[PDB]
Structure formats: structure tokens, C-alpha cells
Amino acid sequence: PVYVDIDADSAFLKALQRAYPMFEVEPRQVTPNDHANARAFSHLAIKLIEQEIDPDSTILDIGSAPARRMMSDRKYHCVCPMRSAEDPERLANYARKLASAAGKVLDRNISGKIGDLQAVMAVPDTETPTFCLHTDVSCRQRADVAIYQDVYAVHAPTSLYHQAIKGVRLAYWVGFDTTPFMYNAMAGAYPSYSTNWADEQVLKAKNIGLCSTDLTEGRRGKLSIMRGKKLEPCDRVLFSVGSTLYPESRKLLKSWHLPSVFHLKGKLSFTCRCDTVVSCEGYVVKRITMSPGLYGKTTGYAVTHHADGFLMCKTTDTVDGERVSFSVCTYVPATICDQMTGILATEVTPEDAQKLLVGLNQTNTMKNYMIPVVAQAFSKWAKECRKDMEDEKLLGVRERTLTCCCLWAFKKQKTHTVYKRPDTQSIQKVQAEFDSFSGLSIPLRTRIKWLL
């Protein structure tokens, strides 16, 4: 019986039960946390992974808090580099957690973890079977399993190659779905997990999930040193999971959208496979398997199955007062998508679509702040579909006109909505075939020994 820190009258509790049928998920709410659904999912995902791999196997745990791996009956060589600000408090809490159980419980190798902690304190560069101060790259502890839990600022092929050359044949990546970033949206929601993200460029928008703006009156033209001339997605993105914030790279998010098959080609070549094994409303687990040698061939295609609807639409907002249009993505519940099928046979207005969506939502099925952007999206889609039906072509025929040369061109129709309905698949041409592949200080090193 897995216990999840969520309210008993929570609708997510049912979806979570559907995502983990091998467990008896029971609500036991201890904290009023604002991203409780996300922690619930990641907790049940670690449970699944443990139940799935064989014991007596050692598990690297990248970017991890050792404290959350302290009462576990499994060899966790927690690779914990002191890079960000989240890490010294993680290490201090791991120390204060071993000390609170040094002479209480003896089914975990508590004293062995204390000894390895003090060994890595006496030597900052050493490697002990349960703890490491190196990065996932510079670590030297061989293992069979690697686990990436909510770690996105990582280049996937470099990190996976560096685990592969250390004997890791199985990696698990738990995190938010990378599909909204393969579509190059400017902003987006993972509404079930209270998560909103935006490009750094649209943080002064008015009506996306993650923004903040001012009252202005519509004054004279604010001067700029730069001409914009083009509002396009840039690398820097901000995620807010509840009220927790993190910056992230689009390049590193996209690196984790891996094809079904890829090849890691260095001094040691590996043939790797990525599958999505858990998928709940935007949050996924990817099981990656690495094998030595070059086997098979790569198409270079990554596929996303859609259990609920995925929308990416064009919205018009004001960023710092200036009215612009950019793309926005969200997840729509499958039952809402099913109940809109009949409405979407006609051209519907965003206002009628909004009142219909509000009727279908009754307790709410989807979050209401995303209903307008969804309504308008459905309205554009139903419109574009009608324009396809009216401008019907001949079967097997393209009306391409010439470029005064050996070149030909065609009209592109305007697409304001990508609507991926429940039970469809997204397929993207991503890269397979990859070839190219000391941060502590004293006052904390002193502090750790003060607890042991």
C-alpha cells in the first residue's frame, strides 16, 4: 500500500491509481503542498522503479538528494554534486537524517552510510558505494542502473554515454513530458501538476499561467534599444511547479526527447532504446536500455502517445503592454476532448466554445484558467477543418508553381492550432546517432562533521 500526501477528496488520486495499477494508492496528506500531485507521481515512480529492477543491483542517482534515499533497501550510490543552491541543504538534511537514525534502525546500513559520508568528507574526491561529490560525468562508481528524477539541466546523450561506459545498462528518467518543447511553444501548462512554464521573453505577459504585468493606461511608445521584429522561442525557460521555480534550457529539455532507437558512438559504442512506461497528464517515466555494440538501424523518430488531448495554439496577449501573438500548449482531459467532438463539426465561436467547456466542467475536470485558451484553440481548429473540407483537392496531386528556375513552390495554409486528440501520436524527427561527447568549500565541510 503506497501512501501519497494528497487530500482524500482529490480527483488526481484516481488518475494516479490508473497510472500505477500494481499498487494500492492511499491518500495520507501530511503537508498542504502546492505541487502535491507532482510529488505523488514522482514518489509512485520511484516505487515502481524499485519494484521493477532486481535487488543487489547498485543504482546511480543523478542530481539527487541523498536524504530521500536513506530508508531504502537498495544500493543507491547517490551522485550528489554541490552545484546549485539546493544541494548544501540537501547534504545537511542527509546528515541530520542519518544522525536521527544512527542507533534506531538497522535494516538499511545506516552506519555504513555514515562512514561513507565521513569518508567523502575526509576526501572530497573519493568514491564511496553510497555517496559522491562528482558530477554524473566525473563520477567513477560503476553501476547497473541509473535514475534521473526531476533533473532536466542535463544533456541526455552525454550523460547516458558516461553512465554506459561505467556499466549502466538501464536508466530511468522521471520528469515532465518533453513534447511541448519539441513543438517549440512559447509558454505552457501542465495543469494537473499545477505547473506553468514560459519563455523568458513572455514573462511580462498578462494571461498565461506564469507571467506578471502592470497597469498602464496605454501610454506613449516605450523606447527599446533593440528592435524585436521577431518574437521566437529562445533557450531560457522558467518552470514553476506550484511555487517552486527553476530555469531550464530548451536544448537540454529537447535532448531528453529521445527516439525509440539511437546509437551512442564513442570509444565504446552502444545501441540504446527509450520507451515511455508511465504517462499521467504531462508527467512521464522513460525507461532507457543501453547495450554494447552497434545493432539495428535508426529511423530518428520519437513518438508521443496522447492519452489526453494536447493543444498548441496561437494566443494574442500583451507582453509589457505590447500586443503580440505566440504559441501556448496545454493538456486537455480526454473526457472533455470526447465531449467536444460533436460541437467541433461546425464552426463555433470562442465564446460559444467557452460556455460549452464551462458547462462540461460542471468540482472541475480541467482547471479554469486554461479554459479560454482552450476554447479559442478549439474554435480555430474547427474553423481550419472546415476550410480543409471546402478546398478539397485531387487524390495524389500537388499544385506546385514554378520559380522561374528548376524550383517550385506551393501555398502554405495558416495553422493556428495543433490539436492532438486522445489516442493519437506525435512523431518528430529527432537525432539518433550521437558521436561527440571539486565544487565544495570548507564552512559546510566543517558543518557536516558536526552532525556525526
User: Known binding site for Zn(2+): residues?
Assistant: 77, 127, 132, 139
106-145: contacts with a second copy (CB under 8 A): none
348-367: contacts with a second copy (CB under 8 A): 350-351, 354-355, 358-359, 361, 364, 367
Query: Out of 122, 153, 234, 245, which residue is the one contacting a second copy (CB under 8 A)?
Result: 245
Out of Zn ion, a second copy, none, which partner does residue 141 contact, by CB within 5 to 8 A per kind?
Zn ion
Q: Which residue from 249, 49, 284 is spatially nearest to 156, judged by alpha carbons? A: 249
Binding piece for a second copy, criterion CB under 8 A, among 70-78, 108-116, 135-143, 370-378: 370-378
Query: Out of 42, 196, 255, 330, which residue is the one contacting a second copy (CB under 8 A)?
Result: 196
Residue nearest Zn ion, CB atom distance: 132
Query: Out of 118, 126, 138, 260, which residue is the one contacting a second copy (CB under 8 A)?
Result: 260
**Minimum distance, C-beta of residue 170 to a second copy, in the bound complex (Å):** 9
141 binds Zn ion per the rule CB under 5 A: yes
User: What would the grid cell of residue 13 be?
Assistant: 488520486
> Phi then psi for 45, rounded to 5 degrees?
-75, -40
**Integer CA distances (angstroms), 300 to 178, 265, 269, 409, 440, in order:** 16, 15, 17, 27, 40
Q: Which long-range contacts (CB under 8 A, 24 or more apart) does 215-218 make?
A: 216/321, 218/321
278 binds a second copy per the rule CB under 8 A: yes
CA distance 310 to 426: 10
**Minimum distance, C-beta of residue 325 to a second copy, in the bound complex (Å):** 4
CA distance 452 to 440: 18
68-87: contacts with Zn ion (CB under 5 A): 79
Measured at the CA of 189, the angle between CA 184 and CA 191, to 5 degrees, comes to: 150
Q: Which residue from 330, 380, 327, 310 is spatially nearest to 350, judged by alpha carbons? A: 380
CA distance 310 to 305: 10
Of the pair 39, 421, the CB lying nearest a second copy is at 421
Query: Who's near 357: CB < 8 A, 6+ residues apart?
Result: 336, 340, 366, 371, 374, 375, 378
9-28: contacts with a second copy (CB under 8 A): 18-22
Out of a second copy, Zn ion, none, which partner does residue 152 contact, by CB within 5 to 8 A per kind?
none
Name the CA radius of gyration of the chain, rounded: 25
CA distance 300 to 430: 5
For residues 381 to 400, the per-residue mask of contacts with a second copy, x marking binding by CB under 8 A and - elsewhere, is: ---xx--xx-xxxxxxxx-x
Of the pair 42, 135, the CB lying nearest Zn ion is at 135
115-134: contacts with Zn ion (CB under 5 A): 132
| Cβ count within 10 A of residue 57 | 13
73 binds a second copy per the rule CB under 8 A: no
CA distance 191 to 318: 22
Of the pair 100, 112, the CB lying nearest a second copy is at 100
Q: Cα dihedral sign for 390, 391, 394, 395?
A: negative
Contact by Cβ (8 Å): 194, 239? no
175 binds a second copy per the rule CB under 8 A: no
Out of Zn ion, a second copy, none, which partner does residue 238 contact, by CB within 5 to 8 A per kind?
a second copy
Out of Zn ion, a second copy, none, which partner does residue 234 contact, by CB within 5 to 8 A per kind?
none
**359: enclosing H helix or E strand:** helix 350-360
- Residue from 35, 43, 162, 257 carrying the catalytic annotation: 35
Binding piece for a second copy, criterion CB under 8 A, among 59-67, 103-111, 128-136, 291-299: 291-299
Query: Out of 56, 103, 219, 404, which residue is the one contacting a second copy (CB under 8 A)?
Result: 219
**Minimum distance, C-beta of residue 280 to a second copy, in the bound complex (Å):** 8
| Total residues in contact with a second copy, by rule CB under 8 A | 165
Catalytic residue flag (residue 155): no
Out of a second copy, Zn ion, none, which partner does residue 391 contact, by CB within 5 to 8 A per kind?
a second copy
Give the residue carrying C-alpha cell 501519497: 4
Q: List, by residue number, the catalytic residues.
A: 35
